[PDB]
Amino acid sequence: TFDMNRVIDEFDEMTRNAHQVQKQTLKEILLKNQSAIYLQNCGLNGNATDPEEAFKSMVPLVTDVELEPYIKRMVDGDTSPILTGHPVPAISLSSGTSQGRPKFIPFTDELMENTLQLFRTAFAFRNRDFPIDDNGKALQFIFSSKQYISTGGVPVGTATTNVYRNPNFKAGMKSITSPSCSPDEVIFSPDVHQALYCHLLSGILFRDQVQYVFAVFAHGLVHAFRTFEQVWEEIVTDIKDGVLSNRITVPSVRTAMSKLLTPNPELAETIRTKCMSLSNWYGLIPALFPNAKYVYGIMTGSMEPYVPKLRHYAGDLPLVSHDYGSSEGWIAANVTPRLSPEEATFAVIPNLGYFEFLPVSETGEGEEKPVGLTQVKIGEEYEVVITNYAGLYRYRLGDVVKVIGFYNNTPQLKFICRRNLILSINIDKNTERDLQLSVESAAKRLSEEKIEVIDFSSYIDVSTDPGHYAIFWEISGETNEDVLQDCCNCLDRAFIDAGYVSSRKCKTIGALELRVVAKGTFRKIQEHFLGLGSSAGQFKMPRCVKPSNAKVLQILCENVVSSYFSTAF
Amino acid sequence: LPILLDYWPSMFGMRARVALREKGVEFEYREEDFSNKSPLLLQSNPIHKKIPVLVHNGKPVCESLNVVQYVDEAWPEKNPFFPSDPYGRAQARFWADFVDKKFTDAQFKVWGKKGEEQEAGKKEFIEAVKILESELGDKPYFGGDSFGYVDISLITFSSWFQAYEKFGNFSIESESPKLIAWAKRCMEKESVSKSLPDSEKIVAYAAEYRKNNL
Amino acid sequence: LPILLDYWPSMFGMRARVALREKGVEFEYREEDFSNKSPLLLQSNPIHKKIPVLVHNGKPVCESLNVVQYVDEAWPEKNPFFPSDPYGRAQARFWADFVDKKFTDAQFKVWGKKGEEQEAGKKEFIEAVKILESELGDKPYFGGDSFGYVDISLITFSSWFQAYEKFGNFSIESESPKLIAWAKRCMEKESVSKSLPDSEKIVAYAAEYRKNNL
Ligand SMILES: N[C@@H](CCC(=O)N[C@@H](CS)C(=O)NCC(=O)O)C(=O)O
Ligand SMILES: N[C@@H](CCC(=O)N[C@@H](CS)C(=O)NCC(=O)O)C(=O)O
Ligand SMILES: CC/C=C\C[C@H]1C(=O)CC[C@@H]1CC(=O)O
Ligand SMILES: CC[C@H](C)[C@H](N)C(=O)O
Ligand SMILES: [Mg+2]
């Protein structure tokens, strides 16, 4: 149960317990996971008076390629305990690409334990700095709307799907966050873009009591706000007569919204009078919820260009930055949320796992052994290696962080990265120029409708016979079935190589399936990626996904606004 | 060659069998007529008259846990069941004893009873199921880096997961894909490949046990 | 220093105490109001909330036979309760397992209940003390040539003998003498000489719970 003062004092106690907690964390991790096969290769049985030393002296640092076969084994019909243990409920994918190939990583309920405690922790620190009403709400542009089963029959996916569909999410987050504006259905609605507009709407419907605006990214907020600048005429009209726009066509959400709709003339007059005042949207974020005392986002790294427009969006509202870490292994919590975006430093939490940092100080790159958490010298930049329950043991994620200070007994971490740049020939191609090419040429059909395609990803299914490649699209707006059917056909027509033709024209692999998804899905992808515990080098996102990709994988399915195989063929 | 006093449906005997096979020994499997128990059985464990009972060199080892431990110690040269540390052996022991006490009784309720014991039995099944899953953290096996003592103790129950699946009117997998699936991974090794009798056979005779007494 | 969560009339706790004192370890004992179980104890076993519990190096050790096995494994250089052979270990384990089945239940039935339940329990315990008599045959101690695993396991039941003798108004000595005889024989070990509280009091505990449930 939530409290700020005790929770902060146990944090002061824990952070001060940084070495003790990191090592004990190792102990529970090894003891819980003694049976792992890599470990048998490694020669480890637990206990001993050199558990940490044995830890760093017996098993080599793993890479995604080496990880991929076993994890592949956990997902493709052989429910198999591997580099972690018990068959994981869901699986993850990290930024960059494993040889350009997709990457698969383990998930467990511990991700929820850590997630819950971290948000409780952070909300306590933030509300400490930024107090909120007990009876208010939070504008959360959050989404976890897609559920599907991988080929093996084991669910595979995103941190968000699992975090909001987890039985514990509603109960766990009810006390420590302000009541969500959006009905859980709209959040889990089969149409995310329609859900973004609706989310804007829901978010916009009780603002008098809003404590803050939420998106995990400054650019996320940027999307919601530019989109805000992309639909309020329609918004006022939809809400005005009490009849929602023809733009949204999914029944669960439509029925849900119509439950809360009636004709009200005046509000239009009001909304209309104020938003005109903005000189072109200067700091409208405070204006729409006049009482939020902050803007919650991740505004560093790949987002540094985006904070000013968010500031441009936020106006004079303070910018608070999100804690760092993922289900892959959480890392740090922002003890000092009120800090400026250009100086945001986040405090590592000790039991999330056991991490080590690989230095860069020789030239580029150099050869120094990984050293202890506080052993890391101030001011220099170290890449991050982590051992946790996330199934990832001693793995090189290849991204650099800089330590600038210490909170109590723990270090403070800052990031300046962009992309985790080590790339090798990818197999989920269809040369990326061609994948991008396909999206570009086909999307022109969607470009006739005053909307430009935003982002995309592709998939390969070995379950179906013949297997069908699945391409997904993030876009500016809603359109009917015919055009997207033409778009699928066009993607098919687009990969110009002699091979794709030999196959598909032959029949050995099925008609390319265009499962047009909804907007923000890639945005979610970005949002979980930059946030992962490592360093800011986490945004060169994967184009095509094979059996081994996962984070785009829960996202692809339930919210397929349109799922169609080529009319051609 | 070692003589295994075993029963076709008995889980624990299945543990014995999976253990000897997993390690790397060639032994003889003996089925039994409880109606007409063999002279060897009656001499080997007269009071209990229960299986498993392995006669090795002329020395009979009853009990599945006792027999798996025995397979381990008489022949501990390649695929060791227990971890080297005493506390580790301890964890395997505590957990194996665990599948064998509360879990066993409850599943016993899930296939052999009616009325309230059935409903109670299913509930205890889930509550128990999460706990074993809960201690697991995320461990591929239980006893050692590969096949283990606790692992040996609970694997035979993999056969019974299908029975619980329909008879218990429950899904051990939808709520806990983890355990049954763990068993599926454990079904790639030859030991469980041939040790555990067909899932369908176990379920049908189980229903039959229900038919024979009221 | 090792710490033990113990109950004054706990044969189980006594299993632990006899074992630890037996090897050669200085330790601490803490009595438990089971009505209010200890934070260290609840931490040891959150669900069972059952003793005896030995804590070493920060790890709670649970279950009686497990605790004694823990005793042998904890300091493997001076006093072993087990014989060198694997089969011997198996015989001892088999017998200790015998100690925990119809035997615990049997005494539990005689001191525990009355009437219809009582006689069933009476014949069960006499029969059990008798089979025990048969396996004992001659040995000073069953666990092996010297004080062993099982010795610690079932010697502890002897203090309750007074209770069983009076409640069922029996005299287990005439039908099976060597058991009780050997029991006070084992009383000589410094392991059980101090760990186990007096019989009149245990019997008294038996008087008190019997007083409540009538
Ligand atoms: N806890 C014992 C169980 C022994 C047991 O109860 N066996 C049962 C069936 S597996 C038996 O032999 N019943 C005799 C009968 O059915 O007549 C073990 O670990 O083996
Ligand atoms: N198998 C356990 C059983 C021990 C046992 O029965 N302990 C009793 C002491 S009389 C107990 O803790 N009862 C507590 C309760 O009923 O919750 C062992 O031998 O350690
Ligand atoms: C601990 C909560 C789990 C996810 C929290 C996420 C949000 O929804 C805001 C930030 C955070 C993204 C990140 O910290 O990596
Ligand atoms: C709450 C979910 C967070 C943002 C996670 N990193 C995700 O984006 O899936
Ligand atoms: Mg995401």
Q: Are A532 and A94 in contact (CB under 8 A)?
A: yes
Question: How far is B164 from B170, CA to CA, in rounded Å?
Answer: 7
- Residue B44 Cα, gap to closest chain C Cα (Å): 12
User: A386 CB contacts (<8 Å, ≥6 apart)?
Assistant: A328, A329, A331, A353, A354, A355, A356, A392, A395, A397, A533, A534
Both ends of chain C: CA-CA distance in Å?
44
Ligand 1, CB cutoff 6 Å, lining residues: B 7, 10, 12, 34, 50-51, 63-65
Domains annotated on chain B, with CATH = 1-84 (3.40.30.10), 85-214 (1.20.1050.10)
**Binding site membership of B: which residues?**
10, 51, 64
Residue C177, number of CB atoms within 10 A of its CB: 12
User: Looking at the CA of A138, which ligand is closest?
Assistant: 3
Containing H/E element for A515?
strand A510-516
Residue C175 neighbours by CB under 8 Å, 6+ apart: C126, C129, C130
Ligand 5 (single-atom ion) residues, CB below 5 Å: A 158, 160, 524, 528
A126 CB less than 6 Å from ligand 3? no
Look-up: residue for tokens 């006594």?
C14
A463-470 contacts, C-beta under 8 A, 24 or more apart: A463/A151, A464/A510, A466/A507, A466/A508, A466/A509, A466/A510, A467/A509, A467/A510, A468/A509, A468/A510, A468/A511, A468/A512, A468/A513, A468/A565, A469/A509, A469/A512, A469/A513, A469/A544, A470/A512, A470/A513, A470/A514, A470/A515, A470/A556
Residue A32, token pair as written in the block:
């819980």
Cis peptide bond N-terminal to A430, omega within 30: yes
- Contacts from A419-422 at CB under 8 Å and sequence distance 24+? A419/A95, A419/A96, A419/A302, A419/A537, A419/A538, A419/A539, A419/A540, A420/A95, A420/A96, A420/A535, A420/A537, A420/A538, A420/A540, A421/A96, A421/A537, A421/A540, A422/A96, A422/A398
Q: Is C10 annotated as a binding residue?
A: yes
User: Is A24 an interface residue toward B (CB < 8 Å)?
Assistant: no
Q: What is the residue whose two structure tokens read 């805000």?
A: A228
Q: Which residues of B are annotated as a binding site for glutathione?
A: 10, 51, 64
Domain ranges of chain A: 1-131+322-416, 132-321, 429-569
Cβ distance B93 to C59 less than 8 Å, yes or no, reads no
Residue A223's H or E segment, with its range, is: helix A218-240
The minimal CB distance from C86 to the residues B62, B73, B93 is found for B73
**Bridge partners (DSSP) listed for residue B207:** none
- Give me the residue from B91, B133, B146 closest to A86, CB to CB: B133
Q: Which residue among B137, B178, B179 sits closest to A32, beta carbon to beta carbon?
A: B137
| Three-state secondary structure call for residue A448 | coil
How many of the other CB atoms lie within 10 Å of CB of B134? 11
Closest by CA to C53, choosing from C67, C39, C36, C72, is C67
Q: Which residue owns the Cα nearest ligand 2 atom 12?
A: C50
Measured between alpha carbons, how far is A436 from A471 in angstroms, rounded to an integer?
11
